[PDB]
Structure formats: structure tokens, C-alpha cells
Amino acid sequence: STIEEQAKTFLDKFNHEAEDLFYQSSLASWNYNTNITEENVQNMNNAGDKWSAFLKEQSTLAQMYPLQEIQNLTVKLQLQALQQNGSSVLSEDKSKRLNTILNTMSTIYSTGKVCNPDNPQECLLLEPGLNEIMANSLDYNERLWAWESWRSEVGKQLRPLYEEYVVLKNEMARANHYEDYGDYWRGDYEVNGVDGYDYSRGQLIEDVEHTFEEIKPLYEHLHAYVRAKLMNAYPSYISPIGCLPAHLLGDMWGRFWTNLYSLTVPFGQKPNIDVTDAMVDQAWDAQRIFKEAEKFFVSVGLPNMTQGFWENSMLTDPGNVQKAVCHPTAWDLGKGDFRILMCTKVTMDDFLTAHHEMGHIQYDMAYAAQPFLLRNGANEGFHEAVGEIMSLSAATPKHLKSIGLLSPDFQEDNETEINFLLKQALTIVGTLPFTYMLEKWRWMVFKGEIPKDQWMKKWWEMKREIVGVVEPVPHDETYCDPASLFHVSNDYSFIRYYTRTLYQFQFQEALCQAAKHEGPLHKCDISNSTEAGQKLFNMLRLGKSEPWTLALENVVGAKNMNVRPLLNYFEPLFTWLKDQNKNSFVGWSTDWSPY
Amino acid sequence: ITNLCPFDEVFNATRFASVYAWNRKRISNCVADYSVLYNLAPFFTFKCYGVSPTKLNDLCFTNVYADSFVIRGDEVRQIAPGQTGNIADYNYKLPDDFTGCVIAWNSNKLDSKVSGNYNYLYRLFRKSNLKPFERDISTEIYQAGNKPCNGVAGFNCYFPLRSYSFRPTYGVGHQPYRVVVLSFELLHAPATVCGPK
Amino acid sequence: NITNLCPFDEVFNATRFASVYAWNRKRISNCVADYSVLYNLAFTFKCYGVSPTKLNDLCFTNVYADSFVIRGDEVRQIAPGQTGNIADYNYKLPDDFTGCVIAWNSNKLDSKVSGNYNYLYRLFRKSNLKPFERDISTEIYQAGNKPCNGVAGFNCYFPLRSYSFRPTYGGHQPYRVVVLSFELLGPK
Ligand SMILES: *[C@@H]1O[C@H](CO)[C@@H](O[C@@H]2O[C@H](CO)[C@@H](O)[C@H](O)[C@H]2NC(C)=O)[C@H](O)[C@H]1NC(C)=O
Ligand SMILES: *[C@@H]1O[C@H](CO)[C@@H](O[C@@H]2O[C@H](CO)[C@@H](O)[C@H](O)[C@H]2NC(C)=O)[C@H](O)[C@H]1NC(C)=O
Ligand SMILES: *[C@@H]1O[C@H](CO)[C@@H](O)[C@H](O)[C@H]1NC(C)=O
Ligand SMILES: *[C@@H]1O[C@H](CO)[C@@H](O)[C@H](O)[C@H]1NC(C)=O
Ligand SMILES: *[C@@H]1O[C@H](CO)[C@@H](O)[C@H](O)[C@H]1NC(C)=O
Ligand SMILES: [Cl-]
Ligand SMILES: [Zn+2]
């Protein structure tokens, strides 16, 4: 008996036991998330602990196959998915130190509060306070206080934790035959071993940086229109040559500019399109919304939903008699069980979120005939993009007038399309330089190009160079501004949002070319397009068995990440941005400071 | 005419056998009315091989065997002449010249518990493939590698039988299915197994 | 007195043959039937009424050439005075049939590695077929005492099912069969 046959036998045992144990852990997590009681906390904390212990035990036995004498690619991919070590290659006093500083950062980010500087008893924490303050207020000093006190009370408490966390994760990465911790997060795209479709870990740097020079002609015009419209709101605070302050971007960290639509509206005479008043007149509920999403999904060739999705899922909140977490999450319990946990109100945003998560369910339903260690996306960017390309097509007025919510005798001019495209660009385009800047900062801190006494001075100049955001207050090297984000202080990868944004528009352009649509890309309805569904199912069926470089060419034709479908979507908005920027200054001067 | 074949004992049983220890009951010296088994729903797995279901009550055969076991819904297609898998290779093999019908139905309302029905097992690891109509009930430890372990499990030594869970929320294809396989033989014998006049 | 050759090439070396449930009827006449060319194929040449040696000796009438595709275990099935699945539901020869049943194994045209599902056979039929009767019906058979109104299920089966015809069986290999049925009881 060879080594690969023993590996296939061990994987056949693991795919029998791990599916049952993961179903137990997912059922305990579903019973916790559907009923927040005390009896479901201990069941989840026992089932997840048993599943983690079983995964650690099977990862311990998987290292007896030395990965070099197996010629099959599927067994090698499952064994690389199974032979992960993590913090097990370090000493115990460091492996528990990393956990007790990550939990310390999590408890500081969750529990840390900011008190008002007029009443020492009145204090405002994160979720009901400054998030709603910096998204509704329009004065300079209140947003300046809400930014600076949050960066002072919470930010500088995490810098001695981050200084140890970086070195501990670098030691953990170099113990697992890497060079830095940024290369470990870049190892998700490592397809080293496939003929004609290889992808190195270091190729992602000059594949992200190469697609960024085509965004900044659109991003510079977008930022030009944003601060040209924001100079009227804040007089004598924003210069027409310099950058934008961080506390005037609509949010806390400057990620999404979607809260700037009330001041940077193109045409304030007419309101935006919404069908909430059309849904509350025809007595629409959550079941009708999900059945209309199902009728949208079966018209391309995707199969019907299972009976368990209509029997065991929670599609409506039962009120204050059974406490449940009202956070929308698509569940993949395995063994043919697919559920959706969502407190669905009668809202157009809920109508788009239902399609966005039925896309995740139909993604989970496609590779059910795969092994258990391949039951995920090919990388961390396809899963949210499959959900996003359904919400792009569900928000079109063609689908809204085809399902019955819109009467056909309405006028659709360009003054609605520009207002829709700028609202789309404030969420999509405005977050990509911030994402690329943060990921390049983390990659240069992890690999050792930024020393410990040059963190904030390089951060606040790379913000000026990439994003165009200048600090309102001079910050020394005691603050830690990346530590004020949820994805950085809780050890989460952030390159997924840059890649998913390009993959979503690549999928949309591919399905629009397959759907034979002659108009613009933002009015492309792929509802009644059957020939595109068989091409999208050729990518949905794969999962993690075959490379993502081959999974792209099955649907979009290209082999790498392309940015031209992203620019083709906002091209009528790009011509309007060229038309509107006739007297403004396209660009920003990095030497200007508001203080 | 009041000598009926025991179809109610191999269909309406209290519990069915496993796929590695499948029961075999000989049916003889009675008339076989195949219009009695229409009471169950859902039912549409009636792939009769060799003979036609319309001419089923026209020919008289010798001693008829009946095999009953429990598998999942996605492995019902493996019970056919010329199929490859884990049930049709290590648990229950049908011949290529099989003359009979395969009858299965959904059993999610009877063979499911909250939470766990571990009484139904299936053989997963075996050295050689099974012969047609062979019943292996051994519990020998499978030798996955080139090293003896002397009856105990561990590295490269696994138990051949694996346990089903059978929870009632297991979608459509992972639901438990009670399968009854009828085999009609044509040996040189006094033929008595055929329907009413 | 040889005037023109009979069209034996279009009924033997055709592009495609029909199935056993939808067998065609090709009538040939007004020519000289030479059977010395017919030994070109490289297995079943049993002739009834007229011996195959003296086949080029008598002057006949309108010959009906029927082309169809069956398997290897059904060459013994199609015979005058037989019953079964093909001789009762698809194609039945008369009891006083005079002619030859020319069958030969091919294993190159009607056997695909993925499956050739273009040839159908009928297994479900109310009554037995008459001699020289063709039925290309497609209605769903009613097996029980319950009208389905067109739907399928137990006691309502589709009568037309397809063969597999893999080039790996022993028997089950496809046979391209052309049967001639002359009705009079010739070169120089
Ligand atoms: C086997 O079980 C079936 C259902 O599990 C039963 O069928 C019943 O048969 C009686 C006698 O004709 C009918 O009156 C009932 O209406 C049937 N029930 C159903 C649900 O179909 C019965 O227990 C067994 N079958 C027979 C023929 O005895
Ligand atoms: C009809 O039958 C076969 C087609 O399968 C062909 O026979 C060929 O005939 C030519 C003419 O003499 C020979 O050179 C070839 O060797 C024959 N091929 C085989 C495989 O036997 C042809 O199309 C027709 N036969 C005749 C005799 O015309
Ligand atoms: C590799 O594994 C897959 C899945 O088990 C199998 O289908 C394939 O035949 C294997 N390849 C080889 C060369 O054994
Ligand atoms: C599948 O979904 C469509 C869309 O609502 C519906 O009309 C149809 O009845 C569904 N089929 C099944 C079998 O549920
Ligand atoms: C497809 O076209 C039909 C007919 O115009 C329409 O009723 C339906 O809403 C469209 N969309 C889908 C998803 O079926
Ligand atoms: Cl910041
Ligand atoms: Zn989502």
C-alpha cells in the first residue's frame, strides 16, 4: 500500500466523522443564535470545543504523511487544508500569551468607552454612540471630539499589545516556514503546484498595486467632487487644494463614504428610488420576498430551495418572547441542510439582503458533492461576490417593474442613474484606496520594512499618498490608529474586500455579456437569462477542488484580477465627474494640514 | 386463494436491518399479489430489471428472496446492475444478470431521532470488493498500511463499520431510505410463486 | 437483360438507421436485384422460402426493406412464430413470412463511450401487435385502475425507454439489421 492510498483512507474516515461533528457544532450554534438562553450557551461551548479538539487531533495525525510523495492534487489540497498548525508550533507560554493578548484586544474593543467632557457619569460606548454621532451630525468640533477622544481613550491602550502581537505572529509565521505574517495571509492565494495556473504568494502585491493605477483617475475625480461638495458644508475648514479630514467622511475610520449622500447629492430636487411604500401597500411579508428571490433564482437554471430551508429557518422575528441575534447570516450546516437567520422587515434593503444571502445558500448548495475539506470558496473573495452580483441585479428598475412593484408608466432619465451611481460609488469606490492602504501598511509592518518607531508617521503620510486623508490633530507615536478598527484588533484578513470588489464587477460583466444586454452595465438584469446560469454553475460547483485562476476563466475568461469591468460600471458616472470637475482641483496636496 | 405471501413482514417491519447485515427471507408456497404494496407514499423508486412490471403477475417462479436494509437517499441509485461506490462494492452487490425490482421509500418519519440514531451501520473499509449476493458481517480491523496492529485500532488501522446519525433535518438526499430488493429466480423447480387467477 | 442496379446501397450503407419502435418501410422495385454484392459485410443470413444459393434465380415483386437497430441477444427473438418483448411490442414478423433476416455486428457506429440514447424500445403496450404493424405512439401507458391524466409514477409508466449500448458488454452489442420481405412465390 502506498502513502496516497493511506491518505485517501484517512480522508475518507475524516470526511465521515467531521461532517457529523460539524453538523453538531452548527446545530448548537443555530440553537444558540435562535434562542439566547443559558441552556444553549453550554451546548454550543461544548459542541464547538469538541469540534476544535477533533480538528486538532486529526491535524496531529495528518503530519505523518509528509506531503511530498502524493501525486494527486485533490488529496494534496485536502492534506494542506488539514495539516495547518497555527499556534501549535510555538511554546505553550507564548501560545497562550498570544491568545490572552488577542482576547485583551477584543475585550478592550468591545468594552472600551468614551466619556463626555462635561459630565463624568455620562459616557458613550461604540455601538449606540459615536457611530450614530459621526453619521448624523454636521458640525466640525463635535465630530473632532468624537474622533480624537476615541483615538485617545481606546487607540493608545492597544499599541503595547500590538507591538507584542506583531512579533508573536511573525515568530508563529516563521515557525511555519514563511517569511512574515503577511505571507501567511497571502498563502490563501498560493496555488503553487498547478501546471499553467500557478500563483505565488508575492504575486498578490504587484497584482493589487497594478490594478490601482486605473482606479485613481476615477478616485481622484470622486474625491474632488466629495470635498468640493463638502466645502459648502464646512466653511473655512477644508481647503480646495489639500486633503480631507478623517472626521468628516461620514463614519469613524473613513472606510465607507455612504453617510455623505445627504451633503454630496448630485440632484436634490428628486428623491432616490425605493419600493418600501410599494411593498407596504400590497401587504408584502418576508415569505413573499424570499419566494420572489426564489423565483428570480430558478429562472437562470439554479434548482429550487430545499424543504428544510422552508421548515427550519428563521425568516421572521417572533418578537420579545424569544431573544435572537438580529444580524443577517447565511448558514451552511452541511449534509443538505441550508438555513437563513435574518430578522427580515419590510424594507428594500432587506429585499436586497435576501437575494444577497440566497446567493450564499445557492453557493453552498452547489458543491455539496465535494469532500469536506473543499467545502468553502476557492479563496476569500468569491463568496461575498456571488451574493453581491445578485443584489446588483435585484436593485435594477427592470427587475422592480418585472416583479410588480413598479408600474411601467414611469420615466427613467439620467438624473436617477447618476444619483444611483454616485451612491454606489460612495460605498464601492471610496473603500478601495483605504483597503489597499491598510493592507500595504500591514504587509510592510509584518515583513519588517516599517520599524517600531515609525508606525504613525508612515501611516499618516501613506494616507495622504493613497487615500487623501489628513489628520485633524497631530498624533505622536503613542496612538495606534489601525487598532481602532474591528478587522485589525481581532486578527482578520482585510485583502478580501479589495479582491471581492473586482471579482463582483468581473462576474457582473461576464453575466451581462452572456445575457446579451445592449444598454449600460448598471441596468443589466440577468433574471430571464438562462444561458448564463449554466456558465455560473460551472464556477459554483467547483468550491475549493480546482484553482481560482481556472475558476475565473470558466466564467469571465481572464486568468487574473481585472479592473476594467469596475471602470465600465461607473463610466456614465465617470463622464459626469469629468463634466462637473471643470473648476475644481483634481488631486490633493499632501503638505496641507488643517491644524 | 387464501395463502398470501408475507409481504407485510418484509415491508411493515418494526425495524430494518443494516446494509452489511442485510436480512434474507425466503418466500415460498403462496400467491404473490404485487398490487398490495401501493399503500406507501412517497414511493417512486420502482426500477424493475429483467422483467416488466406489467407482466409481473403472469409468470410463475421458484423460491423468491427479499433483502431489506437502510441506506441514505443518494445511494439508492447504486442498487443497480453495473454501479460503483461504497454500498455496491463493500456492502451489497447486485449481479449484472439481476432479474428483479428495487423498491425503496422515504423513512425520515420512522428512522430519525432527536438527536441521533446510531443503530444503523455501514461498512466503509474493505480489502476486496464483494461478490454478488454476498453478506460479510466480520469485524476485523482494516489494514490500511504495511504494518500489523494485532486487532487494535490506531495509525493506519481503522474500524470497518461506521455509524449513521440520521437526524430528521438532513435535507432531501441524506434522509434514511428503507430499501426492499426482490429477486425472482428461474431454477428447475416446481413453480408456485405467481399471482391470482 | 440487365437494365439498372437496385438501390441496395441506400438501404444498407445508409447514414443512420431508425429504432425498433419506429422502423421505416423502404419499398424498392423496377430494377434487377443482384445479391452477389451483399456479401460485403463481415453473421446471420438465414433465408426462408427461397434458399440463399438460388436467391438470384427467381423474379419477385415489390420488396419491403425495413432497417432497424437491435442488440445481440435479440437476433433469436425476431423469428416467424415467436413471442416476447420485441416480437410483441415493437416488430412482429408474419407466420408465412418469406425473406431473409440479415443481421451483423458493428460495434463502431451505435456504441458510444458515454452512451447512445437515440434508439428506443417499447415495453408497455395494451395488446399484441399485428404482423407488419408500426406504432410510433407516445402516450403514457396506464398500468393500474387509476387515471393519472398524463402524469407518471407507480402504475403509470412511460412505455418508451432507451438502451445503453456501451462498447464494453459481451450479447448486448448493437446489431444493424435489414430484413427483406419479398412477396412472389433476378440477373442472368
Ligand atoms: C403496511 O403499512 C401501511 C402504511 O404504512 C398500511 O396500509 C393500510 O392498509 C389498510 C388496509 O387496506 C388501509 O385501510 C389503510 O388505509 C392503509 N394505510 C395507509 C397509510 O395506506 C398497513 O399498516 C400495511 N398494509 C397493509 C396492506 O396491510
Ligand atoms: C457498402 O458496404 C461497405 C460500407 O460499410 C462498403 O464496402 C466497401 O466497398 C469497396 C468497394 O469494393 C471496398 O473497396 C471496401 O473495401 C469495402 N469496405 C468494407 C469495410 O468492406 C461500401 O460502401 C459498400 N459496399 C460495396 C461492395 O460497394
Ligand atoms: C485523485 O482523487 C480523485 C478523488 O478521490 C479521483 O477521482 C481521481 O481519480 C484521483 N486521481 C488519480 C490519478 O488517482
Ligand atoms: C420552485 O420555485 C418556483 C419559483 O417560486 C415555484 O414556482 C415552483 O413551484 C418551485 N418548485 C418546487 C418543486 O418547489
Ligand atoms: C421573466 O419574464 C417574465 C415574462 O415577461 C416575467 O413575468 C418574469 O417576472 C421575468 N423574470 C423572472 C425572474 O422570471
Ligand atoms: Cl484612521
Ligand atoms: Zn453576505
Molecular structure report:
Chain C: Residues 123-158 are annotated as: Disordered. Chain C: Residues 4-187 form the BetaCoV S1-CTD domain. The complex is a heterotrimer, with one copy of chain A (595 residues) and two copies of chain B. Chain A has 595 residues and is mainly alpha-helical. Chain A has helices spanning 3-34, 39-61, 73-82, 92-111, 126-136, 140-153, 159-175, 181-185, 205-208, 216-230, 276-279, 286-297, 307-311, 348-364, 382-394, 397-402, 414-428, 432-446, 455-467, 486-489, 496-514, 533-540, 548-553, 564-569, 571-580, and strands at residues 114-115, 123-124, 244-245, 329-334, 337-341, 469-470. Chain A has two domains: 1-84; 178-595, Orthogonal Bundle (Neurolysin, domain 3). With 197 residues, chain B is mainly β. Chain B has two domains: 1-115 and 168-197, no CATH class; 116-167, no CATH class. Chain B has two helices and nine strands, in the order H-E-E-E-H-E-E-E-E-E-E. In chain B, strands 1-3-9-4-2 form a five-stranded antiparallel β-sheet, with no helix packed on it. A two-stranded antiparallel ribbon of chain B has the order 5-8. The radius of gyration of chain B is 18 Å and the shape is globular. The termini of chain B are close together. Classes of the chains: A mainly alpha (595), B mainly beta (197). At the A-B interface, helix 1 of A face loops of B. The structure holds a molecule of 2 linked components (NAG-NAG) (2 copies), 2-acetamido-2-deoxy-beta-D-glucopyranose (NAG) (3 copies), chloride ion (CL) and zinc ion. A molecule of 2 linked components (NAG-NAG) is lined by residues 8, 12, 36, 39-40 of chain B.
